[PDB]
Design a protein around this nucleic acid. Structure first.
Lengths: 48, 106, 61, 172, 146, 127, 197
RNA sequence: GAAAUUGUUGAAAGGGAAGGGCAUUUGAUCAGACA
RNA sequence: AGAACUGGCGAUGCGGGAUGAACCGAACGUAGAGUUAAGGUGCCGGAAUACACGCUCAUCAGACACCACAAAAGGUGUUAG
RNA sequence: GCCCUGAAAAUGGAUGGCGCUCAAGCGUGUUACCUAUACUCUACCGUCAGGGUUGAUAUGAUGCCCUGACGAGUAGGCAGGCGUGGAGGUCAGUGACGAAGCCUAGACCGUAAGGUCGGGUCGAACGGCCUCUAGUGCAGAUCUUGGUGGUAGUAGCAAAUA
RNA sequence: UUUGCUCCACACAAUAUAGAUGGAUACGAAUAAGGCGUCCUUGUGGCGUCGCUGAACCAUAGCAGGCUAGCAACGGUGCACUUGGCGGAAAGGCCUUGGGUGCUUGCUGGCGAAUUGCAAUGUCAUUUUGCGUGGGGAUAAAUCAUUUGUAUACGACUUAGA
């Protein structure tokens, strides 16, 4: 049967599994797309 | 010369079987070049030898031979039936087998 | 498959040897079996069937 | 039902002591052998006269051969078929080389286009069309034109071996 | 039909016997039509049946003929004293057909060597099967079973 | 050295084991007929074990014959071994399991002087 | 005949080629399938697109990671149709799957090898002219294949290096065809022609 | 001083059971006749 | 749910219908050889990706008795009358 | 006629699956081929039936030999045999030079119930056959008594201030 | 942790196999169209020719392939070297130069075989490991314990210490 009333889902299903990360430093999965006209420069940096 | 083959190569396909029941006493051999049961009548009665290797050297060699012969044709695509002195171990499905020319009727 | 009309492996239903263990009675059966097999006389075949009968089938005369 | 043949069958239905010398009926049967030609003979005499197999007998059965089996003819075929709902009459035209070959095409054509089996088809009359410009069907008039030429594009060349070392060409 | 088949000595599949055609026997054949196939045999198929599958019934035993003396011993009082006199008594139905036909054991035939020729066996031969009245084409199918 | 006999066939060389004899330790290896109403062995289903029947009987010509071709006979002393002197090519003497070692050297010595074959000549031999 | 058979997958059907190959693998023959991105399926594009969306929604309810895996590569779509024609749950079928290699485009050393075709599975010898067909490369891109442009860029580079090989091979065989022509009109050539050679 | 059960040693197999039937390969082991 | 005739299951395995106590074929001692039934011959799967005449394109095609569903009514989709 | 609309149910999904489009779909025809414990032939086992044979000097007349047909099966009936405890008779039986029992992917015989042998262990009685007798054969009965497992080195050994 | 480890030349033992026994012989594209040759104004050109299967092509003769002689060619091929270039999608291959050496059945010769006794595959692969040979080559880490808290039920994680 139906629930009793409709209610929203608890939590986000895209952030699964909620496990411990493989390293203390998070990976950069994506980088900005290259533009051949621009000069050579870095895309990211590291800090604390 | 560079070739000493005096036999015709063959392929062990499977046992003589129904949809669910198989008979290990009869084996089906696919001869290369034969595609007609009329052309498969030439190979009737020819001796068949299966050559495999073994770990234990019994008579100065590690190669053992299993002998058989051609009994009759099977189907409409040149497949023939073969009965060996001892049945094939059913692990040679698709393995190459040797079909000789004797006893020749030519 | 055979469509059987009668009963398969059915015995004859008649006695072929006496049930008694009398050794002297079996000697008469042995003697009269030879007689009915080699004389072709109807008398000897009646004696064999009469010698196989039970006590109630041989009333006193 | 099989490779057809044409037979003629003559009935006699048995002469009694009151009426001798009966009328000796006859018709033409398209069948596979002499077994079905006699069976299909009694099927139509029970639709036209007071007669059955037990009250009659077969006089003579003869196979009719084609007079000119090597000449292409135009045939007009009248049939009586039974559909799923009702019975309808139909006239069809088949261009073939013999009377027995036009019947073969008719049974395959009626089963493919109308789902009619052999038991539901009655052969009323088959006749050769003597003159042209009498063909009223469009699928036969195409082959009666002067200087008929037509290609066969996309030749599907049947192969025997499983693997071919060349890329096939469908030229003609 | 079960009782009729037992009166024609057809107790198993692919069994054969000769039947004299009369009014009484023609009505017997119409009852067991969906189970038997019959027809008119020629001389060649009758001759080959007795030579290969000919067995006599002597003292309730199935004794192969194999000799002209055994036929003379049991059927010699009705004229027949050879293997061809019995054959002549069959195809030419004479006054002693009942004793000659009953002397022969029912024929034990095998499956036809070329098949039955039809996809389905239990239909009428007119409709495309194998049973019913099937005349002289019966010599082709009997000789394949023999 | 026995009588010429036809080649011996058995038609079933495997032992007949009871159903579920390898599953439970309480079930012995001796053959017991299944009397169950739902048993698949009694109903002769495909892929199950085979039951003993009268069709597996051996030839009467080669029945009770050893592979050597003789018939096994139990011998306890010198007296019963002397009953096989006229049947040397048919029977073979076998010394019983309860015969002492000092009596086997007399049985074996008498058997060699008569030609009677002994199936177990190595029983309780001092070597 | 050959120890390894390399089949060009261009212009072939999925089910007709898979059934031919699956029967050859069970007979003990190693087969390498190249150019799987140019494989064809009968029927128009949107029919086979909906035939993949209804396959894509079939998954295990309580855990989506253990249900049917929906591979998107053209070499794996053809592998899925070939795996279902072989009893892959037994040891006989497991060994037959190690005799098959399917790739997109023409990879290394199989690039310098002779490629054969199957006349029983070709799209030009089976489909009636006028029937609509689709391409596996276009169908795979619409369902999540990320490397349609990478294979197409690498295939154009291979054809440039393959065209220059044929440019000198055709020039070399012209010299051979002229050398034996000058060797004709000789007494050793008439004896060969009398024997059918 | 048996079985259930357990230890050690030796041999063999193991991709979500194990066990079974028919057939053969491989390994181990056994027999016969040598007349 | 309750009757009439007959055949089956129960009491019965075997080949076929993927699967099933009743359906189809056919009923069973132990083996060998040959031929078939019912059902099948693209692959799984033993056997013609045989031959021949046509029909059908479906944005939920269709695919074999018992059998595991489909109708009235419509279509200038196409075919024949 | 085929196809399409009509035609909407809840886990993901089933012409058996893959897949198939001048089909590997549908209607129909012609042949070839695949094989059931079915049919045909042969051998063997058992049963039943019909017969042959007592002649001595060599041994089974319930014996031997010839011929033909047959072989499914629960409840049930009958027949032929295997095994156990004890009793009469017999083998002038076996045994401290090792009886009985027990162990043995060691061997042989019987269709089977079972029987026999070799090896290891063991220490004082036991068997074959012809007959008699019965408290005579177990996998089950939430069976009885006794013993031992998986669970498992797991639950747990935390009230009353230290 | 008693001279171990690594690469290379061969040496012997084992070990494992889904199956060597002349050659996996490389354009692309179209199919109501193309391949090749040739010519020109180089094109969506003109002309000739080919398909209808790989039933092809190359290779193929010698004690499984010997020992030697000559002739005609200056070719063909094997082998270890050597020169240069190309190939990154899994390149691990391909092309080419220089000689050395072996063979040549392109042609003509001379000897050798038997007895393995009338058929019994008649053995001709690479896979890894181990123990002994010697020609070069290289002289480390991790874990526990201690410690830290960006981490933590326990493991794990993040740090630090000659």
């Amino acid at each position: 049967s139906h629930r009793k009333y409709e209610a929203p889902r608890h939590g986000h299903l895209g952030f699964l599994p909620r496990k411990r990360a493989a390293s203390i430093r998070a990976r950069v999965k994506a980088f900005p797309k290259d533009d051949r006209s621009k000069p050579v420069a870095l895309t990211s940096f590291l800090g604390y | 010369a560079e070739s000493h083959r005096l036999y015709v190569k063959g392929k062990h396909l499977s046992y003589q079987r129904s949809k669910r029941v198989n008979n290990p006493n009869v084996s089906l051999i696919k001869i290369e070049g034969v595609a007609t049961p009329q052309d498969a009548q030439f190979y009737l009665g020819k001796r068949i030898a299966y050559v495999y290797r073994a770990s234990k050297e019994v008579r100065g060699s590690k190669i053992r031979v299993m002998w058989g012969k051609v009994t009759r044709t099977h189907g409409n695509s040149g497949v023939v039936r073969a009965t060996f002195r001892n049945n094939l171990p059913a692990k040679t499905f698709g393995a190459s087998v040797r079909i000789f020319l004797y006893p020749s009727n030519i | 498959g055979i469509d059987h009309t009668s009963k398969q492996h059915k015995r004859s239903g008649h006695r072929t040897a006496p049930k008694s263990d009398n050794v002297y009675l079996k000697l008469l059966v042995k003697l009269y079996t030879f007689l009915a097999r080699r004389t072709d006389a109807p008398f000897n075949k009646v004696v064999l069937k009469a010698l196989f009968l039970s006590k109630i089938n041989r009333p006193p005369v | 039902m099989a490779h057809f043949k044409e037979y003629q069958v003559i009935g006699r239905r048995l002469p009694t002591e009151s009426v001798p010398e009966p009328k000796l009926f006859r018709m033409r049967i398209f069948a596979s052998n002499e077994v079905i030609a006699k069976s299909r003979y009694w099927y139509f005499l029970q639709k036209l006269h007071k007669v059955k197999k037990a009250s009659g007998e077969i006089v003579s059965i003869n196979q009719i051969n084609e007079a000119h089996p090597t000449k292409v003819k135009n045939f007009g075929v009248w049939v009586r078929y039974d559909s799923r709902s009702g019975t309808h009459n139909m006239y069809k035209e088949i261009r073939d080389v013999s009377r027995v070959a036009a019947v073969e095409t008719l049974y395959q054509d009626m089963a493919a286009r109308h789902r009619a089996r052999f038991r539901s088809i009655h052969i009323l009359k088959v006749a050769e069309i003597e003159k042209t410009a009498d063909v009223k069907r469009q699928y036969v008039k195409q082959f009666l034109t002067k200087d008929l030429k037509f290609p066969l594009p996309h030749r599907v060349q049947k192969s025997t071996k499983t693997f071919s070392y060349k890329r096939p060409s469908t030229f003609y | 039909p079960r009782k009729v088949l037992q009166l024609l000595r057809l107790t198993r599949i692919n069994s054969g016997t000769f039947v004299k055609v009369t009014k009484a026997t023609l009505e017997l054949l119409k009852l067991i039509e969906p189970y038997v196939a019959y027809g008119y045999p020629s001389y060649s198929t009758i001759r080959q049946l007795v030579y290969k599958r000919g067995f006599g019934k002597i003292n309730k035993q199935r004794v192969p003929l194999s000799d002209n003396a055994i036929i003379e011993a049991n059927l010699g009082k009705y004229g027949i004293l050879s293997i061809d006199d019995l054959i002549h008594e069959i195809i030419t139905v004479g006054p002693h057909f009942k004793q000659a036909n009953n002397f022969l054991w029912p024929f034990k035939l095998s499956n036809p060597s070329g098949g039955w020729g039809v996809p389905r066996k239990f239909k009428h031969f007119i409709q495309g099967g194998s049973f019913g009245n099937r005349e002289e084409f019966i010599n082709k199918l009997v000789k394949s079973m023999n | 050295a026995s009588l010429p006999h036809p080649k011996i066939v058995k038609k079933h060389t495997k032992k007949f084991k009871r159903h579920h004899s390898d599953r439970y330790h309480r079930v012995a290896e001796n053959w017991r007929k299944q009397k169950g109403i739902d048993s698949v062995v009694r109903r002769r289903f495909r892929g199950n074990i085979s039951q003993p029947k009268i069709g597996y009987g051996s030839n009467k010509k080669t029945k009770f014959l050893s592979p050597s071709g003789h018939k096994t006979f139990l011998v306890a002393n010198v007296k019963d071994l002397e009953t096989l002197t006229m049947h040397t090519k048919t029977y073979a003497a076998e010394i019983a399991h309860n015969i002492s070692a000092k009596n086997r050297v007399v049985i074996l010595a008498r058997a060699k002087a008569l030609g009677i074959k002994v199936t177990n000549p190595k029983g309780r031999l001092a070597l | 005949v050959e120890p390894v058979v390399v089949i060009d997958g261009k212009g072939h059907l999925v089910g007709r080629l898979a059934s031919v190959v699956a029967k050859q693998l069970l007979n003990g023959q190693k087969i390498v399938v190249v150019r799987a991105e140019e494989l064809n399926i009968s029927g128009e594009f949107f029919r086979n697109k909906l035939k993949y969306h209804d396959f894509l929604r079939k998954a295990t309810a309580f855990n989506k990671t253990r249900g049917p895996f929906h591979f998107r590569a053209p070499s794996r779509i053809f592998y899925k149709a070939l795996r279902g024609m072989v009893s892959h749950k037994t040891a006989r079928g497991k060994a037959a799957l190690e005799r098959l290699k399917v790739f997109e485009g023409i990879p290394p050393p199989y690039d310098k090898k002779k490629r054969v075709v199957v006349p029983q599975a070709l799209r030009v010898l089976r489909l009636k002219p006028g029937r609509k067909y689709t391409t596996l490369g276009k169908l795979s891109t619409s369902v999540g294949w990320k490397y349609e442009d990478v294979v197409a860029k690498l295939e154009a580079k291979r054809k440039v290096s393959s065209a220059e090989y044929y440019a000198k091979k055709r020039a070399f065989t012209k010299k051979v065809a002229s050398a034996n022509a000058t060797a004709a009109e000789s007494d050793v050539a008439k004896q060969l022609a009398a024997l059918g050679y």
